[PDB]
Amino acid sequence: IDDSFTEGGYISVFYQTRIVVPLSTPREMDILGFVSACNDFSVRLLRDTTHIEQKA
């Protein structure tokens, strides 16, 4: 959960130089990002999620 004591820090992305294109080329484009766990990753204390409910 959001918790200051166990906060993880900050992910950010910056331009190091700039995107450069020739003529006849799109000047804007997208990047897509992906996240995954490394082989040293684990979880514990099983619990219900807040990501689904059933009202009535």
């Binding site: 006849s24 080329t25 799109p26 484009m29 997208d30 897509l32 992906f34």
Partner: protein, 268 residues
């Protein structure tokens, strides 16, 4: 390789057909399992199976679709998309039971000045959501099974309000993968991405997957192919670019049981 072999340059040959590619991004074998014939220890129908081999396990090319800035995505189901493809289709409609694996090759080339990225997903049991909020599980067989033309995704859910004559079709919303789950997670299914700057094709080798060794190909689709624009098509400064997408699919290790007269389905 110092003899020149590349991850990017492949040749696939099945039956009397060959595909070449010079801009591949390797190829995928779903769940690491290559297609196989049904083993005796897993067998279930006892009659001698038919195995048409090269007559059906060859590359069939479906109708080419068109990718534009307004495209939301496309879908197909297997074996449905191949139901009318040569002797594969015949074997399928003549038998109660059938099983098959597939090599799926999605084709889309453009130029070093175009950009865009297609997510190509092979989904086992790709159940899609219907157009109705008056009746659930109501998509008709005819609308669930488009054959080779496939279907499309939409960016908007819109409920069928004709209660007298319901459309009875799917209404598959793109960011919800047409099934109520988030598209960003579809990468847990076997996939490749055609990112135009990197590659011009996707190749997925799919094993037969099911909770049974063999089943009704006519009643049930084992795999769904979903192609969605993860990054939209773009070119130079043209407002209305277009590039084609072609699907070529080959059945693999297909076998059939329960021969009778041919099935003649109500498809319209």
């Amino acid at each position: 390789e110092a003899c020149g072999y590349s991850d990017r340059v492949l040749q696939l040959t099945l039956g009397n057909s060959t595909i070449t590619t010079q801009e591949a991004a390797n190829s995928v074998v779903a769940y690491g399992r290559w297609p196989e014939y049904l083993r005796d220890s897993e067998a279930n129908p006892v009659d001698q199976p038919t195995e048409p081999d090269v007559a059906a396990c060859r590359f069939y090319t479906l109708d080419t679709v068109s990718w534009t800035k307004e495209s939301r995505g496309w879908w197909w189901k297997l074996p449905d998309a191949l139901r009318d493809m040569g002797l594969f289709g015949q074997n399928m409609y003549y038998h109660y039971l059938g099983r098959s694996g597939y090599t799926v090759h999605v084709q889309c080339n453009a130029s070093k000045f175009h950009q865009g990225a297609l997510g190509v997903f092979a989904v086992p049991e790709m159940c899609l959501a219907g157009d109705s909020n008056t009746t659930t599980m109501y998509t008709s067989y005819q609308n669930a099974n488009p054959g080779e033309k496939g279907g499309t995704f939409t960016g908007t859910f819109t409920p069928d309000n004709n209660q007298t004559s319901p459309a009875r079709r799917f209404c598959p919303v793109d960011y919800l993968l047409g099934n109520g789950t988030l598209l960003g997670n579809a990468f847990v299914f076997p996939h490749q991405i055609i990112n135009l700057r990197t590659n011009n094709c996707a190749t997925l080798v799919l094993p037969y997957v099911n909770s049974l060794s063999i089943d009704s190909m006519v009643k049930h689709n084992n795999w769904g192919i979903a192609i969605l624009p993860l990054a939209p098509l773009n070119f130079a400064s043209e407002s209305s670019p277009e590039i084609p997408i072609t699907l070529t699919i080959a059945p693999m290790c297909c076998e059939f049981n329960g021969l009778r007269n041919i099935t003649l389905p109500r498809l319209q």
